[PDB]
Amino acid sequence: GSSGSSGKRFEFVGWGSRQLIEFLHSLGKDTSEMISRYDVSDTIAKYISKEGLLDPSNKKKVVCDKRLVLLFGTRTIFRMKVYDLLEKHYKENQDSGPSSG
Structure with a gap:
């Protein structure tokens, strides 16, 4: 393996806030492309x-x-x-x- 990490940090972390991101990251969600709220929400309902x-x-x-x-x-x-x-x-x-x- 050999890849970057992050350069020049800015507001938020992609499309959603780290909070949501991390949360999705943990769950095992691949925060690659802007996910649909309904989805994240749906997953939350399930996770809950x-x-x-x-x-x-x-x-x-x-x-x-x-x-x-x-x-x-x-x-x-x-x-x-x-x-x-x-x-x-x-x-x-x-x-x-x-x-x-």
């Missing part, structure tokens, strides 16, 4: 269950364990919010307004 982050009081919710925390930084979230949660991480200018609906 896979690991068992789900909540007993309400499965509809999600109880972050660590990875999710290091990702979002929250203790609990909505299995759905996931999509949005990522919507943030992911780069790419997102035009919207006026108002935050």
Whole structure:
């Protein structure tokens, strides 16, 4: 083997934030080409269950364990919010307004 690593670090790490990246890296996701949110989100929904982050009081919710925390930084979230949660991480200018609906 013999390859570079990284030169001249800049905002984010590719298309998504390191947080999301790393998280995907660990899981074993090949953050090669811009992945579709739905996917990452879908994987999250699976991972949440896979690991068992789900909540007993309400499965509809999600109880972050660590990875999710290091990702979002929250203790609990909505299995759905996931999509949005990522919507943030992911780069790419997102035009919207006026108002935050």
